[PDB]
A and B are shown apart, each in its own frame.
Chain A
Amino acid sequence: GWVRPDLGELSKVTKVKTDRPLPENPYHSRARPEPNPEVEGDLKPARHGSRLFFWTM
């Protein structure tokens, strides 16, 4: 027997059942230290002009 696999039947991406479920982070690594603090909210309006030397108003 052993039918010849037709062109191109060594293709066709394959499913296969296993022993283990897939591991977490095999990269011996760590997570991020500290992400970016979300600075949001209703932004305050103008605060007493430019707060430069002068040029309020």
Chain B
Amino acid sequence: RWIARTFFDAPEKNYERTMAILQIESEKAELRLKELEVRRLMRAKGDGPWFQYPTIDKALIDHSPKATPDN
């Protein structure tokens, strides 16, 4: 009785620790699987804001009247 009193944790303490750690890891696992699905559909469809390799920007484009109208 003294050993369980002064040297040990309660079964309810261990129990709620187990429930807390399992809720944490369930959220972690579903976020990881959701991550890889988002990533594969994003690289597939291309509409996502991640895999945008840079195209032209029109900071080097200026429309103005030329020296030949058949431009």
Instruction: List which B13-45 residues lie within 8 A (CB) of chain A.
Output: 24, 27-28, 31-32, 35
Q: Specify the main secondary structure of chain B where it touches its partner.
A: helix
Q: Are B49 and A36 in contact (CB under 8 A)?
A: yes
* Minimal beta-carbon separation of B58 from chain A (angstroms): 12
Interface status of B9 (Cβ within 8 A of chain A): no
Task: Tell me how many residues of B have a C-beta within 8 Å of chain A.
Answer: 9
Q: Specify the main secondary structure of chain A where it touches its partner.
A: loop
Please measure, in the bound complex, the distance between the C-alpha atom of A13 and the C-alpha atom of B31, giving whole angstroms. 64
Q: Which B residues are in CB contact (< 8 Å) with A48?
A: 24, 27-28, 31
Give a binary string over A18-57; 1 marks a CB under 8 Å from any B CB, 0 the rest. 0000000000000000101101000000011101000000
Query: Which residues of B are in contact with A by a Cβ distance under 8 Å?
Result: 24, 27-28, 31-32, 35, 47, 49, 52
Can you report 8 A-B residue pairs in the complex whose CB atoms are below 8 A from each other?
A36-B52, A37-B47, A37-B49, A39-B49, A48-B27, A49-B28, A51-B31, A51-B35
